[PDB]
Symmetry: C3
Subunit: 28 residues, 3 copies
């Protein structure tokens, strides 16, 4: 009995990893 709301929850957490890369990678 999979809930429609639960699939939606999954998309919000992966985008966070992309944001860290823009700030930097190791230095300049």
């Amino acid at each position: 009995r999979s809930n429609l709301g639960w699939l939606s929850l999954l998309l919000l957490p992966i985008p966070l990893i992309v944001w860290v890369k823009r700030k930097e990678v190791q230095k300049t």
Copy 2:
């Protein structure tokens, strides 16, 4: 009919990061 559509939009953007790794190579 409106709010449901927005959650779907969020998933397409992260998958893009995975694709660059598949490309491999380097020349930037």
Copy 3:
């Protein structure tokens, strides 16, 4: 155009790449 079920499929595969990053493989 795409089915409602298809958008849900897209969220499940991106989470996997982040786990790989924690492992931190050689080279790359």
